Design a protein around this ligand. Structure first.
Ligand SMILES: CCN(CC)CCNC(=O)CSc1nc(N)c2c3c(sc2n1)CCC3
Ligand SMILES: CCN(CC)CCNC(=O)CSc1nc(N)c2c3c(sc2n1)CCC3
Ligand SMILES: CCN(CC)CCNC(=O)CSc1nc(N)c2c3c(sc2n1)CCC3
Ligand SMILES: CCN(CC)CCNC(=O)CSc1nc(N)c2c3c(sc2n1)CCC3
Lengths: 396, 396, 396, 396
């Protein structure tokens, strides 16, 4: 039970463990594409004296954080231990080895999507974004008088085949991801993959359609079994106009009873309708999880609310260092210190605060974040909050 | 079809319309108690030339708003039109008459709980608070190391009959409602009613139990049909310690699979667990709706974030006046003006912003709130936000 | 947190804990009756410095074991720890104290019905009987030619009110319980209770009917919600004739689609039908659990298969002693010894073997029962097996 | 309507009737393989004056019976009458003709798997084995301290592709089938078929995985629609160690909530867990059915319990002869006689007793098995019982 970087010869065994450990696995032809995003020495395997009984890897990603700042981000993925080798600390060992490599390569943050809500807290990952399913009974949906694009003349939205308008979707996603906290650069090979799932599969998913605006798009397909439900796989909009116009078109799908979409808690859709309640929240879950690899590098890299005045403090991260934090003009300076700590928190808590998804007040109430000064808590809340609301890019 | 204040002789007819129009109706013996909270000339009826084909009334309530300020609040309730008299503008006429009386009696705000999400926007009511059902699979629930009250020695929580500890529940609710935006004064007669629903009914709801802390309580009963689900009808806690201690006890109900509770979006419960995801959000809805009756009186009455610096502007409410708004030191001055408007919004939008439940950014994205300056939008967001998270008191 | 016998003053607090800890609780008026079966010093409570945070008790029962031998049996029941006092070893302490008293009072065995399948193994209780739900689609049910009582002339079964034929039900149950392993003496006060549940409750269970034979009875009621299902609460029959005759009558309920009954794995009903499969097994669970308090006293007290020849061995019970076991002529002699052990098992395993419900072969395969000689295993299997099939009397 | 052996020209018509009469039909490409196991003159068809309106056939099988004795067994299969020709005695005629051929070819027993529980009793077939679905909530499953292979060091179980380890599965199944009552020889062509269903089908079943031990294997796949359920299609284990080790691995499938398997009533899995009840019995059905073709040949061929002493009797089978049965030393001598019968039974009853699945006591209680001496009944029970528990090999 030794812990090595995989050879080319090791990948068939990894794909076997993958098939057994993840049901959503596409298969080796699709993995070719994602593999391209794994750097050299971005993967560890655990052989038994053989076959693969444990694997982890990271991908080179570009995460947009508050202040339209883009960080290089190690995306952890393809983590699996064989059912034959559970409770043997193979996960503790593999994660520890990748976190060493991620740190020494100079990534300030790591990120992942959790398959359980209880595994990842103990390795310093905090839930940083919130998925939020809205389901619209579109039979009752009337737009408010105040809603944009509710006059005479033509629609600016077209119904199209996704495959014939790849260029426009790329353009729009690129604009979107650069100005939205949680945004990820989506490389060429993941657009190849997104548009191979647009085509209908025999006895599988149905044909995907696109609504295309100059400044937005929405990919949607009808559900496999429930033929009165349209699922909106992806809606990107750079302007309120684009967002409203796309939803007028989705509400216009008169052969459907319901439109479902996985979106963020601040999605404005409910306020576009005469009746807010027609957009029922049916489902809610942690989205992207962040581990802050270098605290000073990460805290300094992002923007903060201009609205709160300049203020200073000492932050202590359990087994992560202690820092003089000074925040004014929406910039931060984070420097070493041995001065008495004013705030303590575990590294995962910092991960949750970082994209402005979770308020310090809330985490403090749970005693996940200790301080003795509530004015300092009001100020963290206010500073760390994101002007633009935080969103989940794509699963990896 | 004339519109009058009801005589004593009119109430039997109102109770008939009530029984037909509301399924959740307790019956005339229970109405005695709520009636006490309706002022003289707080009720209108519509007779047919007879019988009652339309009624509305308001109750005298005390709503806690940001800055621990308590406003006198007209609570609209018992609104019904006979099925025999629909689409006859009886609602438009009754609401218009009560809103006159509410305004002339000097109530700064009115409030209600909506039976549909689409009726109340057009009369100037905005959804001001958010209900949020959490359901815990308590079989998997382990508390985090950081959670308060997880050591040796005794528990501070007792299991009790609700009826024998009315005094303590009152004390605690009184403390809670005075420091929490959305808090309502609960008069003697509504505690009589709350504790008459604590006792098991033949072929109805099961016996209610209470967990009592020095600084918190939780009323709970097992579900009628689903005997592995406990419903938490009410949990009030004045301290993080009380809140944690009460949830340790609820998770300790080892004969249950699930605990459900209707709570607020900032409930810290999820952060108390090793696995945030065990506390699934199963349901979400508008709670309390506010109509701002006097804009200057209401805007001036509440507190604002100290964290944002002093700033000025002109707010225009559609058919509600135009005001020079000046906000600094968490106080506001709101005075008449004919100066060019910087912000426009309908009166319902103001209602939604007022308790800090909804961000101006979000309502602006839906074009429910027009401005041409996004720095002013950042500032409204920041000012109107509530330090203490907004909660829903009780239904009326 | 001290551990005492309850005063009369302590019972209200126990009834409160009961209501909170058991949903199936009838209420204090019904407890009067069961209380009569609890000896003096048969109950322990745990007060907090007060109120009751923990209780256990045993009842004086008479368990019929193989060889129509009747043992005095401590029936453990009413075991509860407050949700406010979990994981505090109150259960470990209460069970340890009752087991001392049960042992010193000279009970050879203790018994209980488990609310979870995982709590009771560690205190030396083994599942000793198996409940088995049969559900008959009675529309397709035709009796075999070989089935008794399928000729001309009159039926010997009558449809009656249970309350007017208490005497006959008692007579028959008394006959049944004396000749059937798992049989319990049912005292006067538990017949009072059984016949108070026969009468229909407002918005609860429906009226119970009885089919009465000279040598059998069946109590049945139609299900609350599913009106095409009859539930057979209890069927006792002393003769194959009685059993067949009662089932002809139940299959004769032509307004029902399904008859369900909770019975034992050897119930002959399936073999009475032309189609065995019409009697689907829908549910299966451990019934009665036994803890063997005195190994020599219990092993010596029961009968064994005459069919296996005389044979000897050394049995070792973990922390329960080591015994020279000699079995011939369906009697056993069990005497102390320090000779090398041939069979080892934990005390719960012995409990499972004792009424002949579980084969040693099976428990050996799970390594719950160690031996190095498989001829000795064949012999235990054969000896401990019950000629008459083991059944579950009533829940306590 | 004549009754002939099929020509090569008749098989297309049989395949048509097959497709219409059996939904689980694979299609003619798969039938090539099973056809190989049908002897010459093992099939009858009924033409209409044409097309095929009725078919039956038998396959040459090798059934393992108690005493590790292997009998040649006619496996009846592919029995169908056209919907156009029901209630015309085509089944009575076809079965009668095959039973003549099966008898004259010198097969001592015939076997089948029933599509209804009520058709096959009247042709002398008795349910001989019991299928038993266990479903494990594997989230709560902890193994007992007594369970084998729960120490440090390596696992002996590997996760593999089934297709690359055919040899090992064959070896293990061969060992298993020779020592287990109900065991069937599985020829080369049925391993070809088993491993063609291991591969995922488009819009059908998912990829099958194997857990391989030196002395056991388990084939499993995730359910089509329910993605949190793993179905265990086949688990063969020659040692308790193999069985425990394979289940540790299945419980180790951490992405599943439930493991279901179709197994036998004596499966030791429940006793391997700290909580027996986590292994719920969800489903139960007759498995293999036996018709005893030659009573003396079959009764003499199998082994009997050594534990019961030598004893004699006269058995009478309705329209099947009368025999002096003498049983001692686990051998039987069965010779003709006209002496007064002590036991009577129909031929199906004998089929049920033969593999030791059903106790004579039970069938006697249903009057399916008449005797006037209950000591003789105790002795049949004890003799016919199988030391090794009876299992169901594969469906045909
Ligand atoms: C629940 C687990 N999942 C399935 C893995 C997580 C991924 N969940 C997704 O939604 C995206 S599908 C996907 N994602 C990848 N990162 C990859 C990678 C491949 S192959 C692939 N496939 C080889 C290199 C890394
Ligand atoms: C969906 C409609 N509902 C039922 C009315 C709304 C009230 N919804 C509740 O949850 C509280 S029950 C209640 N509430 C009242 N305000 C009152 C009042 C009575 S009688 C009563 N009863 C006479 C004077 C006013
Ligand atoms: C799941 C828990 N259950 C409810 C207790 C177990 C009992 N389960 C039953 O089915 C019988 S109802 C019953 N049984 C009793 N032994 C008793 C006793 C009372 S009151 C009563 N009531 C006071 C003295 C002991
Ligand atoms: C419910 C009916 N079934 C479908 C037939 C029973 C068989 N049930 C099974 O599970 C095995 S699939 C199978 N079995 C066969 N014996 C055969 C045979 C073929 S083709 C085939 N296919 C030609 C010669 C005999």
């Amino acid at each position: 039970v030794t812990l090595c970087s995989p050879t080319e010869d090791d990948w068939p065994g990894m794909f076997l463990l993958a098939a057994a450990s993840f049901t959503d696995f596409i298969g080796p032809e699709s993995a070719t594409a994602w593999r391209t995003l794994v750097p050299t020495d971005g993967a560890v395997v655990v052989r038994d004296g053989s076959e693969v009984v444990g694997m982890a890897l990271y991908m080179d990603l570009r995460l947009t954080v508050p202040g339209e700042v883009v960080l290089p981000t190690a995306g952890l993925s393809f983590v699996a231990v064989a059912p034959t080798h559970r409770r043997r600390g193979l996960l503790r060992a593999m994660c520890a080895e990748l976190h060493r490599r991620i740190a020494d390569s100079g990534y300030p943050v790591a990120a992942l999507h959790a398959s359980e809500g209880g595994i990842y807290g103990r390795f310093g990952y905090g839930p940083a974004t919130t998925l939020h399913e809205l389901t619209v009974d579109r039979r009752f949906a009337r737009f408010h008088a105040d809603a944009p694009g509710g006059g005479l003349g033509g629609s600016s939205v077209r119904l199209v085949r996704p495959t014939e308008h790849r260029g426009e979707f790329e353009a729009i996603y690129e604009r979107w991801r650069q100005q939205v906290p949680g945004g990820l650069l989506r490389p060429q090979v993941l657009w190849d993959e997104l548009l191979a799932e647009a085509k209908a599969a025999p006895g599988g998913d149905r044909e995907s359609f696109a609504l295309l605006h100059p400044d937005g798009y929405a990919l949607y397909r009808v559900d496999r079994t429930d033929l009165k439900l349209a699922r909106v796989s992806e809606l990107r909009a750079v302007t309120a106009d684009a967002h409203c116009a796309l939803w007028r078109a989705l509400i216009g799908l008169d052969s459907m009873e319901r439109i479902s979409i996985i979106t963020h808690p601040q999605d404005p859709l409910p306020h576009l309708l005469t009746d807010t309640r027609l957009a029922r929240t049916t489902w809610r879950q942690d989205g992207l999880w962040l581990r802050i690899m270098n605290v000073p590098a990460a805290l300094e890299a992002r923007g903060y609310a201009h609205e709160v005045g300049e203020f200073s403090t000492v932050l202590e991260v359990s087994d992560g260092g202690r820092f003089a934090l000074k925040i004014g003009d929406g910039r931060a300076r984070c420097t070493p210190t041995d001065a008495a700590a004013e705030i303590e928190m575990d590294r995962d808590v910092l991960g949750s605060l970082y994209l402005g998804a979770h308020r310090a007040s809330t985490l403090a109430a749970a005693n996940r974040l200790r301080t003795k000064d509530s004015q300092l808590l009001r100020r963290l809340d206010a500073a760390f909050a994101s002007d633009v609301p935080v969103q989940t890019a794509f699963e990896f």
